């Protein structure tokens, strides 16, 4: 049940709320107050999805879809089958996410480590809210949010982009993509480096922190450092959504034309027009 080095860490404490009440483990999983609330929201969310899905025309995983209301319902309530289920599931999603995050904070505290991971987890939660809450509020209707379905949510992303003619020219998108690319590249470099040092091949000696920095100084004339690559990695990943958010929320509320035309601020300066 326990890892070979686990027992000494299994002490009480580190909770935000509850005290000893929920301070226990179920198998490997820690519980805590937010474990209880997480399970609650998950159970409620999954139940609603099942009930809503049974009312639809298919049980095929790719084809099932739970969609928001028509635009005309605005920010109000909608009939259960005409967007109400979507509204409830959204609430459950947010509750589960925030619960999950806070649980991680309790686990960090118990372990005597920093809260870096739950803080990092606030980023994707934040982006979800930009898509499903903040942008729809600014546009005035929940119906602008994306639907819950494996293939259907892709169709939303697709049409949304084309509403602005060519979404590739969206400047917040350009930043978002750049960070997606550079992060995935940096993970490959970093992962590859650490493995290359610990697995030199044949029966050769494991190499060193000195070798790490020499490799990258040789290849590119600079090595960022062992700790620093972990700060950088977190920064690059986070900025996929931190910068992306600007391009998403701008589209509609602050810009209604196609994105290429936005670049007229540069192209149409009188002196070189």
């Amino acid at each position: 049940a326990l890892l070979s080095f686990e027992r000494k860490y299994r002490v009480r404490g580190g909770t935000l709320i509850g005290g000893d009440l929920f301070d226990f483990w179920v198998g490997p999983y820690f519980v805590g107050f937010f474990g209880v609330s997480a399970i609650f929201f998950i159970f409620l969310g999954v139940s609603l999805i099942g009930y809503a899905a049974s009312q639809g025309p298919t049980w095929d995983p790719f084809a099932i879809s739970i969609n928001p209301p028509d635009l005309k319902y605005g920010l109000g309530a909608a009939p259960l089958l005409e967007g109400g289920f979507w509204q409830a599931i959204t609430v459950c999603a947010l509750g589960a996410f925030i619960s999950w995050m806070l649980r991680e904070v309790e686990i960090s505290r118990k372990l005597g480590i920093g809260w870096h991971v739950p803080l990092a987890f606030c980023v994707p939660i934040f982006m979800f809210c930009v898509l499903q809450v903040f942008r729809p509020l600014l546009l005035g209707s929940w119906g602008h949010a994306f639907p819950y379905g494996i293939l259907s949510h892709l169709d939303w992303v697709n049409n949304f982009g084309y509403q602005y003619l060519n979404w590739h020219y969206n400047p917040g998108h350009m930043s978002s993509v750049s960070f997606l690319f550079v992060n995935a590249m940096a993970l490959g470099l970093h992962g590859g480096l650490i493995l290359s040092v610990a697995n030199p091949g044949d029966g050769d000696k494991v190499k060193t922190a000195e070798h790490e920095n020499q490799y990258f100084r040789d290849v590119v004339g600079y090595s960022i450092g062992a700790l620093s690559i972990h700060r950088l990695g977190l920064f690059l990943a986070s900025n996929i959504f931190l910068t992306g958010a600007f391009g998403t929320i701008a589209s509609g509320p602050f810009w209604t034309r196609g994105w290429p035309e936005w670049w007229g601020w540069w192209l149409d300066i009188p002196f070189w027009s």
Binding site: F5, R7, K205
Partner: protein, 243 residues
């Protein structure tokens, strides 16, 4: 006729889809998840055959470790339930339980690529210094969580392999000794080093080094763990609910 068409209503893209899923799950479940089990197994209270590393400075290691000795835990179970938390039977910082826990790392000095001691004070590393513009903490007071002066900084310990300071060394006030503190537990100001992890009195029991001018991997673990334990155990309120 169509390119990629096969017998039945079957086509080549379709076949590659099953192959793709097969490869991915084979790698994940039959390799990556087995590599995940090289530490912490077998569990107590599927495994790969052992991996052996040839060390850079002589000797080898095969993981996971089997230690010739094991430590006696000053912990009491809070209940008979399988998943119940444990409870310290003494002083958890000195007894090293919970977030005060340290690992049985080798009692060997971490080495540079050329075989010298890696983590050393500047009194030994005389070719190293602090970068122009940054605070030199030597001679500054160390102020503990209770706002009491716990000691005075006497040296910095530098990692000679990465060029990175990792500990301050301070004379412990009224205890005729010096203790190391990881720089992560220091908030470096111009006139003081602020340490909120432990109270002033608790500096007295920081794990001591066997030699004054070097430190082993296990000693580094012991030292770091002590302050971490303070985050939960420095005062009685820290083990309780925040709200």
């Amino acid at each position: 006729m169509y390119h990629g068409a096969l017998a039945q209503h079957l086509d080549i893209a379709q076949l590659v889809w099953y192959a793709q899923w097969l490869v991915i799950w084979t790698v994940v479940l039959l390799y990556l998840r087995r590599e995940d089990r090289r530490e912490g197994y077998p569990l107590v209270e599927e495994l790969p055959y052992p991996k052996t590393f040839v060390l850079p400075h002589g000797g080898t290691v095969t993981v996971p470790r089997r230690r010739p000795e094991t430590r006696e835990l000053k912990l009491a179970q809070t209940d008979g339930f399988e998943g119940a938390p444990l409870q310290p039977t003494g002083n958890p910082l000195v007894d090293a339980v919970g977030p005060a826990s340290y690992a049985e790392r080798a009692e060997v000095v971490d080495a540079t690529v050329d075989g010298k001691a890696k983590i050393v004070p500047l009194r030994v590393a005389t070719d190293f210094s602090i970068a122009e513009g940054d605070v030199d903490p030597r001679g500054l007071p160390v102020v503990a969580a209770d706002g009491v002066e716990a000691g005075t900084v006497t040296d910095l310990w530098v990692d000679r392999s990465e060029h990175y300071f990792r500990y301050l060394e301070l004379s412990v006030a009224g205890s005729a000794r010096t203790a190391l503190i990881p720089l992560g537990f220091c908030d470096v100001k111009k006139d003081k080093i602020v340490v909120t992890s432990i109270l002033s009195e608790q500096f007295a029991n920081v794990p001591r080094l066997q030699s004054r001018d070097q430190i082993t991997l296990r000693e580094e673990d012991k030292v770091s763990a002590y302050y971490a334990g303070g985050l939960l155990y420095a005062t009685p309120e820290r083990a309780e609910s925040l709200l």
